[PDB]
Amino acid sequence: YLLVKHSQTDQEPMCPVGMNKLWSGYSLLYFEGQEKAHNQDLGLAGSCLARFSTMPFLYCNPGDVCYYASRNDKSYWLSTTAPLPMMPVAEEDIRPYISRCSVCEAPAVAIAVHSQDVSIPHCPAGWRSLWIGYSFLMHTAAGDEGGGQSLVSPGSCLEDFRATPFIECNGARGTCHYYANKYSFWLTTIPEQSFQGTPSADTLKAGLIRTHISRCQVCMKN
Amino acid sequence: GYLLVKHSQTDQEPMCPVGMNKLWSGYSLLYFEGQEKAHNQDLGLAGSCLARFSTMPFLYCNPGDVCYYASRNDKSYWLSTTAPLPMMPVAEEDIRPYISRCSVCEAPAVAIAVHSQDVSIPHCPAGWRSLWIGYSFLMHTAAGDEGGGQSLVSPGSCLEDFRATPFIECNGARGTCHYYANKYSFWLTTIPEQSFQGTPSADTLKAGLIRTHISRCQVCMKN
Amino acid sequence: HGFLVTRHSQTTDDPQCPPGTKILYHGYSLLYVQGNERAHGQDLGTAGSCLRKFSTMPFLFCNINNVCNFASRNDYSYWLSTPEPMPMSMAPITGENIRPFISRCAVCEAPAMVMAVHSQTIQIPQCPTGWSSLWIGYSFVMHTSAGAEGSGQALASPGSCLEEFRSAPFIECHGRGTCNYYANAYSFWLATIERSEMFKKPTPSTLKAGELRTHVSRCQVCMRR
Amino acid sequence: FLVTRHSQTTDDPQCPPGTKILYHGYSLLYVQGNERAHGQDLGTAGSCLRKFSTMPFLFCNINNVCNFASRNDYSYWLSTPEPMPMSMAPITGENIRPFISRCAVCEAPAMVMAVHSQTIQIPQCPTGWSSLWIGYSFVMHTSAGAEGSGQALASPGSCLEEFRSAPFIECHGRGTCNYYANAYSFWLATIERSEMFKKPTPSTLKAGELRTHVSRCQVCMRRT
Amino acid sequence: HGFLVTRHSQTTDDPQCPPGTKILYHGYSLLYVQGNERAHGQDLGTAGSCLRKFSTMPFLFCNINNVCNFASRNDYSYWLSTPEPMPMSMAPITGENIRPFISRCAVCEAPAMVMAVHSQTIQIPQCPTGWSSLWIGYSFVMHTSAGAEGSGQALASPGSCLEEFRSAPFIECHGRGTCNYYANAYSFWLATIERSEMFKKPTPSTLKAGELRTHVSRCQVCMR
Amino acid sequence: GFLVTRHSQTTDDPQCPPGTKILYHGYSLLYVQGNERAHGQDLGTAGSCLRKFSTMPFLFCNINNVCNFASRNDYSYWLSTPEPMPMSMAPITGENIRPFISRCAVCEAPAMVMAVHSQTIQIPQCPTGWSSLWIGYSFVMHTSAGAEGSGQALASPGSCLEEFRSAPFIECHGRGTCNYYANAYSFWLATIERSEMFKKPTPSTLKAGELRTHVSRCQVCMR
Ligand SMILES: [Br-]
Ligand SMILES: [Br-]
Ligand SMILES: [Br-]
Ligand SMILES: [Br-]
Ligand SMILES: [Br-]
Ligand SMILES: [Br-]
Ligand SMILES: [Br-]
Ligand SMILES: [Br-]
Ligand SMILES: [Br-]
Ligand SMILES: [Br-]
Ligand SMILES: [Br-]
Ligand SMILES: [Br-]
Ligand SMILES: [Br-]
Ligand SMILES: [Br-]
Ligand SMILES: [Br-]
Ligand SMILES: [Br-]
Ligand SMILES: [Br-]
Ligand SMILES: [Br-]
Ligand SMILES: [Lu+3]
Ligand SMILES: [Lu+3]
Known part of the structure; x- marks a missing residue:
């Protein structure tokens, strides 16, 4: 099994004590080609690309012509906690904003469990805890494009809630930036034991958010 | 029987030009969203001035002879006022101060809009008089990739008051409206070049340094 | 000055031009088309919604290699329909069997401006002072079908005023x-709104056969005198 | 290894033989936020939530402000045989409970997969594998705004035990x-090998003539 | 009385206003724009499709925080083009080199309203009685480009009647x-429909250079 | 019981890689589109391998208990062979479609199978302790009608096509x-020099004869 860890810092994360690292890279969320998003599961090795670029892909048509950084495509990456920039950052200035990752060869499968409660969900019997966090569900940015995580995948359990955990890189421009239409979606905490048929609308400001976000824990068998 | 439509961008009905009889006043309708599909009204046409407001002014039916009113997840969008951005959705009566008003006036001739794509205000065609000057409002987007735009020759594309967020979203059955972060307004730019700009220079503009970067326009009427 | 007004019969019969107008030509009622999954409509109040010749595929497309393809992919066309019922099989209609389902239209020249007004009530809105009546109907604003794509009508255009309410006005x-x-x-219509409820949370309503058209906004198409 | 099962009723489904239960929950098909659909494969634990809510998530913006159940978002769940009210009006509150399918997430000793026949016959499990259950080939679906998601055909999620013209609410x-x-619910159709490369013959089927025209599937585990 | 009519040369030369109308201004032919992945066009029959200044990015967008961004993302603008040959390299054109590819337009003031009529045959449709001809062309309906996004023309408007048929009318x-x-x-045009084919399965056709213009509906722009 | 699916990209059945055993063969399904909504099957999974082909492998049902098969305007996309379009460039039908569809094999493997990408013209090496199953080119996503489409997980064998094709699907x-x-459109990982990772991309337009040489390479490995 392959355990994927995203540091959410400009430093590569360490692999668990008893695990060999296959490679390190940059946290890829999704590509957008022809305004169609194609995502990588944050819990799968595909979300950890060894080499970064504002435009890491090219495209071809049946006429046997391929175009690289010759149109208007873009890429999205999991970001670090660096503060929001006033203007787009270019080239070398992008580095501090891209989350780093490591792919580790593990002994057994890893899963994520979610409580939909303020309490941390316990790992199944015969399973050990790797880390705890918040239930990251989906995201949207340019247009209605975006994507989401598999709740059983470790990628759906980010160590801490973050309003805008990803950044947009505008392909051929060679710049990345945080735009106002960026949304992150998270599972909520539900007071009821198991059934809530009538949600009570609410707007949450900094400091009063986390108590409303579902908790999770990533576990590995044994 | 030509019609002139004016949107105040305030909670007060606009006055029709002297000599033009007002057919009616209403609320500034930008667009409806049904099944996540936007259907806009040209701000320069009378259809954009709806006499009676409602967070859900429409209903829909399917071929099985069943119609649903405010029974799903549709919405409506309206031109807004200068009322301050609320910290949370405003409900029912509290919505009123946020909705722009409009008037439909019977005019003697067809009115048009001209745009400069410059800091300088464009003149009306020879023989035409100015009704008002404003800023070049091109298009907009909000929920999802839905939204719409104005006809540059229509008076609807020329708003007297520039505003980063000229419209508000009403969430249909909820009976509330609010300003969400994915709301975008698009305006024609002021181009430094005289007539041909083959290489734009990216830029980010903060408040106070915006209006001088927005194309200007005038709404005109012959005579 | 050359004002025009288009009318749709919603039947296989050609509709008569409204009082005070003269016939230009008749055709079939085109609502909208969908090419490469993108919908583009023609306002029912304009001559563009009235084509002399019908076809399930009224258009073709071409690429930059100078190759055009006609009825060679998976595109659509939508037309206002008649009261002809669906076959008992509920299976797609083909060939000559399609004829009875397509609405007819008339493009007429008017001596002055033509517009529509909506009451947003079950009552017919009166024409503005000095304007004469061309016809009345129901407030039809937009529609959607395959892929939730669709188009709609301008609320001051005669096209937003359908003369006969149909839960399924197009095919x-x-x-x-x-x-x-x-x-x-889906067909979307302006709803009835009591002035006192304009700023009150809408009251949900589920309507069935027999009580549909009694809760839809009414309209009148008028022409300047 | 995990295996997820959906009862498609208000009763908790039982873990298939050879597997142990982890937890039970409600069957989540997909959610729709800001007009974008995002599903959880029915063959994974993500399709099984411990708690139900018409709005099980919230969204947050660039200004670090989150909004919960304030806009026009959706949640879709596998449903039960519960009849649609005669009024055909929306269901609310506790009255919703009878319509929501239950699920079980179980730990299995070996990998599990689904196979499809594309005929009215049940596809055999590969040599060396054992049957957990049989059903109908469920491929994808769409609802509001024609948005939707689908199932991986190799996953048990693409094999529903009870065929339903309307499997979700x-x-x-x-x-x-x-x-x-x-x-709309999309299922794999039945195809006669003699007609694989022939124009498909269009067909419109009605109640009682449905199940017999949908591909069959079997969920198998690589053990014993 | 003052009614505008816009004409597109589809070349680098300014088109001349048709007889009976007087020129107001000339510009470049804007087909449509694409911002935040949404297309928005300007009907080719209106002055909005004729801009005094050309730019690959003639607009900017502003957000709820009162911040506007100009040419910093991935938005588009589409213009009617000229017969200028596509570069041998097939690589993107930049700066001043773009000029030869952009169509010019003219906005003229007419004494009466103008309309377009379509034959849906190879015959030039006659103007209604009481209307005079301004020009003839081919029935242009809609188009799509990046992201399959696009817009179209009102068949009743002169914008739906392009004087020069082009398989690739815009850039x-x-x-x-x-x-x-x-x-x-992709450019979409009204097809030529034969009377006995109206209610028959359309006969599929793939056409190549030389047999194109002959299978496209003709139109005529007329003025009262 | 780990699984790995392989696609021949020809009319011949592909063979299971050394060290793995065959379960069954079929036709290569890339994705389907119903009600204008695309849904794909990762090429590295058994879901992309159907025992039976058809231009319409699915049907749809509504809440009135009525199902429709091949009765609207839906699509199906399949990995293809080297067979070119007929000179007429018109759609292919019936038996003539056979030569265009790729075959696939669903195989059972002794251990985990994964793909690695070099993002260079070099073939990436399998991790220490892993053996090779096959090598290819980095195929990541695709789009077609309406710009809808789907893609491959970069660690999935499906992101590693053995033969580059500018048009890999029909x-x-x-x-x-x-x-x-x-x-x-077919999208592929590009080659990136380490010193260029954080530099503005250098645009490139490639033509026949220089395509394959500018695409990232990959290798499918098994522990
Ligand atoms: Br291309
Ligand atoms: Br690009
Ligand atoms: Br558990
Ligand atoms: Br922004
Ligand atoms: Br907090
Ligand atoms: Br419905
Ligand atoms: Br609603
Ligand atoms: Br927001
Ligand atoms: Br083509
Ligand atoms: Br077609
Ligand atoms: Br009724
Ligand atoms: Br909501
Ligand atoms: Br059953
Ligand atoms: Br049945
Ligand atoms: Br841009
Ligand atoms: Br030709
Ligand atoms: Br149906
Ligand atoms: Br079909
Ligand atoms: Lu989109
Ligand atoms: Lu959309």
Whole structure:
């Protein structure tokens, strides 16, 4: 099994004590080609690309012509906690904003469990805890494009809630930036034991958010 | 029987030009969203001035002879006022101060809009008089990739008051409206070049340094 | 000055031009088309919604290699329909069997401006002072079908005023030559709003056969005198 | 290894033989936020939530402000045989409970997969594998705004034990749920090998003539 | 009384106003724009499709925090083009080199209203009685480009009647300052429909250079 | 019981890689599109391998308990062979479609199978302790009608096509036709020099004879 860890810092994360690292890279969320998003599961090795670029892909048509950084495509990456920039950052200035990752060869499968409660969900019997966090569900940015995580995948359990955990890189421009239409979606905490048929609308400001976000824990068998 | 439509961008009905009889006043309708599909009204046409407001002014039916009113997840969008951005959705009566008003006036001739794509205000065609000057409002987007735009020759594309967020979203059955972060307004730019700009220079503009970067326009009427 | 007004019979018979107008030509009622999954409509109040010749595939497309393809992919065309019922089989209609389902239209020249007004009530709104009546109907604003794509009508255009209410006012056709009604063919109409409730949370309502048209906004198409 | 099962009823499904239970929950098909659909494969634990809510998520913006059940988002869940009310009006509150399918997430000793025959016959499990259950090939679906998601054909999620023309229900942040006319379920069709490369013969089927025209599937585990 | 009519040369030369009308101004032919992935066009029959100044990015967008961004993302602008040959390299065109590819337009003031009529045959449709001809052309209905996004023309408007048929009538430009013709740029035109074929399965056809213009509906722009 | 699916990209059945055993063969399904909504099957999974082919492998049902098969305007997309479009460039139908569809094999493997990408013209090496199953080119996503489409997980064998093709898939319709269209786009990982990772990308337009050499390479490995 392959355990994927995203540091959410400009430093590569360490692999668990008893695990060999296959490679390190940059946290890829999704590509957008022809305004169609194609995502990588944050819990799968595909979300950890060894080499970064504002435009890491090219495209071809049946006429046997391929175009690289010759149109208007873009890429999205999991970001670090660096503060929001006033203007787009270019080239070398992008580095501090891209989350780093490591792919580790593990002994057994890893899963994520979610409580939909303020309490941390316990790992199944015969399973050990790797880390705890918040239930990251989906995201949207340019247009209605975006994507989401598999709740059983470790990628759906980010160590801490973050309003805008990803950044947009505008392909051929060679710049990345945080735009106002960026949304992150998270599972909520539900007071009821198991059934809530009538949600009570609410707007949450900094400091009063986390108590409303579902908790999770990533576990590995044994 | 030509019609002139004016949107105040305030909670007060606009006055029709002297000599033009007002057919009616209403609320500034930008667009409806049904099944996540936007259907806009040209701000320069009378259809954009709806006499009676409602967070859900429409209903829909399917071929099985069943119609649903405010029974799903549709919405409506309206031109807004200068009322301050609320910290949370405003409900029912509290919505009123946020909705722009409009008037439909019977005019003697067809009115048009001209745009400069410059800091300088464009003149009306020879023989035409100015009704008002404003800023070049091109298009907009909000929920999802839905939204719409104005006809540059229509008076609807020329708003007297520039505003980063000229419209508000009403969430249909909820009976509330609010300003969400994915709301975008698009305006024609002021181009430094005289007539041909083959290489734009990216830029980010903060408040106070915006209006001088927005194309200007005038709404005109012959005579 | 050359004002025009288009009228749709919603039947296989040509509609008569409204009082005070003269006939230009008749045709079939085109609502909208969908090419490469993108919908583009023609306002029912304009001559563009009235084509002399019908076809399940009224258009073709070309690429930058100078190659055009006609009825060679998976495109659509939507037309206003008649009261003709769906076949008992509920299967797609083809060939000559399509004829009875397509609405007819008339493009007429008017001596002055033509417009529509909506009451947003069950009552017919009166024409503005000095304007004469051309016809009355129901407030038809937009529609959606395949892929939730669609188009709509300008609220001051005669096209937003359909003379006969139909829960399914249009039929879906395909380049392959088939047409049919689908459960997701939705018609949107202006609702009735009491002035006192304009700023009150809408009261949900589910309507069934017999009580549909009694809760839809009414309209009148008028012409300046 | 995990295996997820959906009862498609208000009763908790039982873990298949050879597997141990982890937890039970409600069957989540997919959610729709800011007009974008995002599903959880029915063959994974993500399709099984411990708690139900018409709005099980919230969204946050660039200004670090989150909004919960304030806009027009959706949640979709596998449903039960519960009849649609005669009024055809939206269902609310506790009255929603009878319409929501239950699920079980179980730990299995070996990998599990689904196979499809594309005929009325049940596809055999590969040599060396054992059957956990049989069903009908469920591929994808669409609802509000023609948005939707689908199942991986190799996953048990693409093999529903009970065929349903309307297998899921639509809910809104408002707290309302209902079956709408545009709710479509897509299934693999049956194909005669003699007609694989022939123009498909169009067909419109009605009640009682449905199941016999949908591809069959079997969920198998690589053990014993 | 003052009614505008817009004409597009589809070349680098300014088109002349038709007889009976007087010129107001000349510009470049804007087909449509694409911002935040949504297309928005300007009907070719209106003055809005004729801009005094050309730019690969003639607009900017502003957000709820009162901040506007100009040419910093991935938006587009599309313009009617000329017969200018596509570069041998097939690479994007930049800066001043874009000029030869952009169509010019003229906005004219007419004494009466103008309309377009379509024959849906190879015959030039006659103007209604009491209307005079301004020009003839081919029935242009809609188009799509990047992201399959696009817009169209009102068949009742002169914009639906292009004087020069072009398989590739427009060019795509980006805020970056690059423009080019891409393989997914599609132009849709009204087809020629034969009377006995109206209610029959359309006969599929794939046409190549030389047999194109002959299978496209003709039109005529008329003035009262 | 780990699984790995392989696609021949020809009419011949592909063989299971050394060290793995065959379960069954079929036709290579890339994705389907119903009600204008695309849904794909990762090429590295058994879901992309159907025992039976058809231009319309699915049907749909509504809440009135009525199902429709090949009765609207839906699509199916399949990985294709080297067979070119007929000179007429018109849609292919019936038996003539056979030569265009790729075959696949679903195999059982002793251990985990994964793909690695070099993002260079070099073939990436399998991790220490892993053996090779096959090598290829980095195929990540695709789009066609309406710009809809799907893609591959970068650690999935499906992101590693053994033979590069500018047009690796063919489009089919419920009406029984299939063909290549100009807007059928295939997206691949590009080659990136380490010193250029954080530098503005250098645009490139590639033509026949220089395509394959500018695409990232990959290798499918098994522990
Ligand atoms: Br690009
Ligand atoms: Br558990
Ligand atoms: Br922004
Ligand atoms: Br907090
Ligand atoms: Br609603
Ligand atoms: Br927001
Ligand atoms: Br077609
Ligand atoms: Br249906
Ligand atoms: Br009724
Ligand atoms: Br059953
Ligand atoms: Br909501
Ligand atoms: Br419905
Ligand atoms: Br049945
Ligand atoms: Br841009
Ligand atoms: Br291209
Ligand atoms: Br030709
Ligand atoms: Br079909
Ligand atoms: Br094509
Ligand atoms: Lu989109
Ligand atoms: Lu959309």
